[PDB]
Symmetry: C3
């Protein structure tokens, strides 16, 4: 039971050429694009297990003091997100009590203006108008006193341009049981004493200089250090597991993540507050309040791998034979009207 | 050499109508579902690069003291996960030494009951029984003394309902080099001074009120503040790049994430311990231990975008043409067997 | 206006059995692989919403002191990632001033050797050279003094083997509106009082012991606690929503994540520094510096679910009928060449 349809042959006369040309065009597309370029003959994996450990080094001088890594890096646990502080405003010896507010927003002349109103922001309002200075009068509050003044101008820590960052990374593709890290076996204890990362002269040393990371992202240090920002470091593992074990290597990229802040005029940077707590010999308690500007780094990891396997080869190859057989038959029917016309 | 197979024509309009109806049905399905609704003529992109910066404001009174953002928020770095503390239990001036244990599950009547048997809790057992009070007798430990009492009832900080959260977000689609943030160009300082988020009256102000978030999640503040919980805030960027640049818009949603806690009866909330360390003029050291209940927020960002292209259009058009031809040929034999 | 092709039937004994066998094989492949093993008749969902809360308990002796959870666990907010400290090196009462260095990499003979040219990350090199001991001479710096000594040997805290970890997890599949947690409805306080996890004797108690986790990962505590490392805990929710509600359960797995460290000789572990700040009755400020080695745990959640629907069923059935119809038509042309040959 063949059950094969009948077919009639036609002398070419510039029609048989069209038969072979199209029959050869489609067989080109599968070999050229589906197999050789898109690599449809192998199984892909995109779920990657990763791990990042970081460490920073360097010292600087700021406000008649020396600051080391325990002073300007928060949080200290060496994770993949951390901040480097480049500018601070400091208020010393705050205690609980009553004091006048310092900002221009809280101006009053008599006791009536500020009571239960003006509720957004500000501590608890007592309900009196007092003299902040000779020419200014503001409403009294209850809280930590004295209040801070953040309108003055302070210098930045210029030495932070030379600090170094050390990144240690490990990956694993669970489907193929493949493991590698970014510390290559060619790295010796003597090399790490002097190497620095450079994208073409030394693409594998894990030590990055802070001033260069800002440079590769197209920014300016003297301006980013004064308002703060967020920078990203990306590591990519795109590997073909047929070739060899030592052809799998990482690639680094750099960019700036908080792109809205450059063009905005209502919120241009990045800052936060924190405090340190003390206690006297008596029970009294006081603290120190700091407002900090800085640059936030974070490391992002991605990748995928492929390896030859028999099952996707058969499935895609069968579709190739089906496509040419079906493709011609439909091309025959459309050519019947073309030949009839 | 076209080599077209022979074709037989059935003059019956009774079958011609069915042939035409089926062909129109198939072409209708392709032109309506694959193209217009599913938008198969454009290239998708789902890998989004994001960034979140937050800040909190407000003051309240608790235990005859005024507390502010450096007191009730932890960790202080302004990331996308943070906690607001609404209730505390405080133990003052702990030092190292020997003391009895306060809990009733450590009851004893002689030196023999508690030895190396029960390992955890407090510190290291010493092997003696001592009077905790006039009616209770637990057995002694070594560690920070005195131990904390956990069963008393403390009030919550009611003013935490009015605190405000400010969220700043930025995205980028690397395939199309598209960048936008949730601070629209219409925003000004005067608007910043008074706006508040509302899903229909003001859907774009970045300032959120805590009570409103708890309300939108469908919860009750007087219970969430007493047991603790986890709430989620979601921002979605689903926009089409063929239209104008000023119609890619964020959408906000709210929900509660630790849904098992309210059902369960063995662990109903969220709490933790932390301490503060001091030192005397002499070398001696002491500390203050705190157990804190609170609400945890975290911001989640997702999205995808598409843009018209040529290659998917060509592929889908060729698929439609070949499906028309193949669908006809099989239906030809189908009616050939039927009739 | 209907159309049909013409069919030729040849009742060859071999051809009939061949085409029936091939058609049966195609039907078998569709009914066995596509609809049964692969479950093509249902809709998938892989976006999962999760939440994790942890808590640790235990006490131990270390350097004539008793330590508890507020001392050995950082950070303290009970999130997915945390560290347990097993070894420390402590420097007491550091203050600002001038002092000589301690590391052997800073030796002198005369003042001219170490100046601005040698940048070692030292806070500053005042430019002199001073006696450190009776047989060593390094050159002076400015910063927190005295500097720390890093090469001595310290014991590890062995009681950390018996600490316990409590994990509370909640998931939700938004598509099907499905919610469940890892605290099963038949868990009581009395069971909570004494249960421990065991992969076959008790697979649902959420209390894990640290030594058991280290063993399941395939490691050795006596040296993991001495160098440091990173371990992973995985929870997987893979369940079918056609069955009963109480058949969706979690599965636990354990592994080590920083696999590059054990095979390397330039960076074998995981450590970091942090500090505690004090100040006297005067303004004088001093601190205590600690270098910590530990084990970092982190919890990873994943899963997917499926549920019966009608649209994928219709699509797959139509595809199966078309492939059967196309398969017969295509093969017979191919079989004609076999029949002709
Ligand atoms: C191969 C390409 N798309 C295509 C399909 C096609 N057909 C479908 C099969 N078929 C049948 N089952 O009878 C014959 C008709 N004909 C075509 N002709 C062309 C030439 C550019 C003009 N591309 N192309 C593809 C599809 C589906 C694929 C699915 C997974 C991975 C790769 C694919 C890759
Ligand atoms: C179009 C729809 N699935 C379908 C396929 C089909 N065939 C395969 C192609 N083909 C050939 N290559 O000869 C003819 C036979 N015939 C059909 N008939 C129907 C009507 C509902 C009843 N849906 N449908 C699809 C598939 C694959 C798709 C792949 C990517 C994106 C969208 C797709 C969308
Ligand atoms: C079924 C299998 N792949 C296959 C396709 C095929 N085509 C279909 C279109 N078609 C048409 N439109 O005429 C006839 C030609 N023919 C085939 N023959 C074989 C032989 C067993 C090796 N596998 N196989 C598949 C495809 C597409 C699928 C899409 C989604 C999920 C599962 C799929 C699973
Ligand atoms: N949680 C909040 N509630 C109300 N207003 C806020 C909040 N956070 C920020 N703002 C307002 O948004 C504007 C931009 O904030 P920005 O990040 O620039 O703070 P800043 O101006 O650097 O310092 P400050 O905290 O004193 O405003 C500020 O004018 C501030 O008043
Ligand atoms: N790591 C752990 N090891 C052993 N038991 C634990 C652990 N964590 C919690 N539990 C027990 O689980 C129960 C539920 O704890 P929950 O999260 O409600 O904290 P809690 O009731 O405040 O416990 P505690 O008062 O001990 O902090 C408690 O009875 C506690 O004893
Ligand atoms: N940011 C950095 N800049 C320069 N060198 C670094 C940096 N981080 C680490 N190293 C060097 O890498 C080597 C391996 O680091 P690792 O942290 O494992 O050693 P370590 O014993 O902690 O060193 P150290 O005691 O100096 O911190 C060390 O010799 C260290 O000097
Ligand atoms: C950092 O090092 C450079 C030399 O590489 C030096 O010129 C510069 O002064 C240093 N940075 C600062 C701001 O001191
Ligand atoms: C080590 O191998 C890498 C990758 O092949 C190579 O780029 C590098 O130069 C090698 N290093 C040495 C010192 O041979
Ligand atoms: C405690 O003593 C300090 C001086 O050491 C004094 O300033 C303070 O007012 C006293 N506090 C109280 C509550 O008496
Ligand atoms: C918050 O402000 C409202 C007025 O807007 C006030 O009525 C309310 O009492 C405040 N919250 C609390 C709990 O005090
Ligand atoms: C700013 O632009 C958005 C559209 O991007 C618009 O919906 C909004 O109303 C504008 N702002 C105001 C305050 O009108
Ligand atoms: C140190 O002095 C304090 C009083 O200031 C005293 O209580 C303590 O016992 C002394 N230290 C020790 C270890 O005895
Ligand atoms: C933990 O408890 C076991 C008994 O269950 C005990 O033998 C062991 O010594 C304890 N751990 C350590 C290292 O002390
Ligand atoms: C609780 O139910 C599970 C099945 O959901 C069962 O395996 C387990 O044995 C039950 N608990 C006990 C203590 O038997
Ligand atoms: C305060 O006293 C300490 C000693 O306790 C001394 O070192 C310091 O110089 C004094 N500070 C002032 C400002 O006199
Ligand atoms: Mg300000
Ligand atoms: Mg308790
Ligand atoms: Mg060292």
């Amino acid at each position: 039971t063949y059950e094969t349809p009948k077919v009639i042959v036609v002398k070419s006369w510039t029609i048989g050429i069209i038969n072979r040309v199209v029959q050869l065009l489609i067989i080109s597309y599968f070999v050229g694009w589906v197999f050789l370029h898109e690599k449809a003959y192998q199984v892909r994996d995109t779920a990657i297990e990763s791990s990042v450990v970081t460490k920073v080094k360097g010292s600087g001088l700021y406000a008649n003091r020396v600051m080391d890594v325990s002073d300007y890096v928060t949080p200290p646990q060496g994770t993949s997100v951390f901040v480097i502080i480049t500018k601070m405003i400091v208020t010393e010896n705050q205690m609980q009590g009553f004091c006048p507010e310092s900002e221009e927003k809280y101006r009053c002349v008599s006791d009536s203006q500020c009571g239960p109103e003006r509720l957004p922001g500000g501590g608890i309002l007592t309900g009196r108008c007092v003299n902040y200075s000779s020419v200014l009068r503001t409403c009294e509050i209850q809280g930590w006193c004295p209040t801070e003044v953040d309108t003055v101008e302070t210098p930045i820590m210029m030495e932070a341009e030379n600090f170094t960052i050390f990144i240690k990374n490990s990956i694993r593709f669970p489907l193929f049981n493949f493991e590698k890290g970014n510390l290559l076996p060619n790295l010796t204890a003597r090399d790490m004493k002097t190497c620095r990362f450079h994208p073409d002269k030394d693409p594998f040393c894990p030590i990055l200089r802070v001033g260069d990371v800002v440079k590769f992202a197209g920014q300016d240090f003297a301006k980013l250090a004064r308002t703060g920002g967020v920078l990203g470091i990306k590591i990519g593992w795109v590997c073909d597991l047929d070739k060899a074990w030592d052809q799998c290597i990482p690639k680094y990229s750099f960019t700036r993540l908080d792109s809205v802040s450059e063009k905005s005029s209502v919120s241009p940077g990045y800052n936060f507050r924190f405090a340190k707590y003390y206690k006297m010999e008596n029970g009294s308690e006081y603290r120190t309040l700091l407002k900090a500007f800085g640059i936030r780094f974070d490391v992002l990891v991605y990748g995928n791998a492929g390896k030859f396997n028999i099952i996707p080869t058969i499935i895609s190859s069968v579709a190739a034979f089906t496509s040419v057989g079906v493709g011609t038959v439909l091309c025959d029917i459309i050519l019947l009207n073309f030949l009839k016309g």
